[PDB]
Design a protein around this nucleic acid. Structure first.
Length: 117
RNA sequence: CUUGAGUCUCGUAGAGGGGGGUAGAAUUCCAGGUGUAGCGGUGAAAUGCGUAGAGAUCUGGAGGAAUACCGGUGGCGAAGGCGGCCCCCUGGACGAAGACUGACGCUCAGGUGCGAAAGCGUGGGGAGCAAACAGGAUUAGAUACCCUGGUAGUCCACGCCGUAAACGAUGUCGACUUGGAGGUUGUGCCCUUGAGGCGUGGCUUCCGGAGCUAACGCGUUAAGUCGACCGCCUGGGGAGUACGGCCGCAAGGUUAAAACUCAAAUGAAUUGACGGGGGCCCGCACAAGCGGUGGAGCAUGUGGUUUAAUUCGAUGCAACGCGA
């Protein structure tokens, strides 16, 4: 119960998972979302209707603070960059600044050699 | 005596390196902080890792790799190859002026020197992350393509090992032979008015005349015309195999056959076919509804069995209320 009332949201999307962690502007998290525990398990996720309902998970733990406006920074590859925005727009929150803050690798190390097909 | 070769002065393009620190644009271990209910992964699922507090975010932080931009058909080097900048000190390529050198020129069987990765022993190191190794997953089954952890050893360095599609599958050197569109570097002349023209060198790019070739394809970067010089070639498999020699302490390199067998092997290209290669179209072919077979009984034919015989043929779409 701190009532920061505003904080950015980091949306880490992968090829098979998406998690929405709402932090403040300084770096203090209030509530994070998840896709592995949205009822079903295995690999049925990574699809829009399962990613938006996963993003809706912060509508039960972040509302207790009093966030009426927030920002969103998406990051990581995978389908669902629009499903999470639709989920945030349908949850009752606002939209302040949409950025892609994905970690850009600059080839510091060597990439793996698992794919040979 | 210069026009071949070599040489001076001034510069210009350009990952030429050797030794040395510097130290990033991002990075895994080892901590502090906000703080919950899961991180990851493949088309399905899971091993492992989270309440011993992970993945998400801020602070700085042990050490090895190494360029995302530049970065590219860029550009260099005899080749194998070289990416954070500098200087220590060496290389190659090119030009305008001037010279003298008088041929000092090209190539080479012997032979030395350069040699991708890995391994050996000597002295170290342990991240990112690696053949083997231990699990999950699939399939009729998996010593693998999939998902996760990893020993000496890949790194600096001392010598062995010297191989490959070290392939422009196109030796080296020099002289002449129709042509068109580009890339990186310079300046001469032309009001340089300028990004710009006319030249003039350079080598790497794309297409093509004659000509040559079996065609594909070469064609001022030659495989067209020549001259000098070196290597190699003689049907496949056997076979880069066996023996002996040279070298390597051993893991191998080189020189390098024979017996036997095969009546072929091969290159190019014209046809069709095929492909879980692509593209473009057609059909109640699908897409949406109606009526059904398959559910009950009966008729009929067929597949099996019995029968002294249940006649024969038809037998996947092209067979079964068919010959009837």
């Amino acid at each position: 119960r701190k009532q920061v009332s505003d904080g950015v949201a980091h949306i880490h999307a992968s090829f098979n998972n998406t998690i929405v962690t709402i932090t403040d502007r300084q770096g203090n998290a209030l509530g994070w979302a998840t896709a592995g525990g949205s009822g079903f398990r295995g690999s049925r996720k990574s699809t829009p209707f399962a990613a938006q309902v996963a993003a809706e998970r912060c509508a039960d733990a972040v509302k207790e603070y009093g966030i009426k406006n927030l920002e969103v920074m998406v990051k990581g590859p995978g389908p669902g960059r629009e499903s999470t925005i639709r989920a945030l727009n349908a949850a009752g929150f606002r939209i302040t600044n949409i950025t892609d803050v994905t970690p850009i690798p600059h080839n510091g190390c060597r990439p793996p050699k698992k794919r040979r097909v």
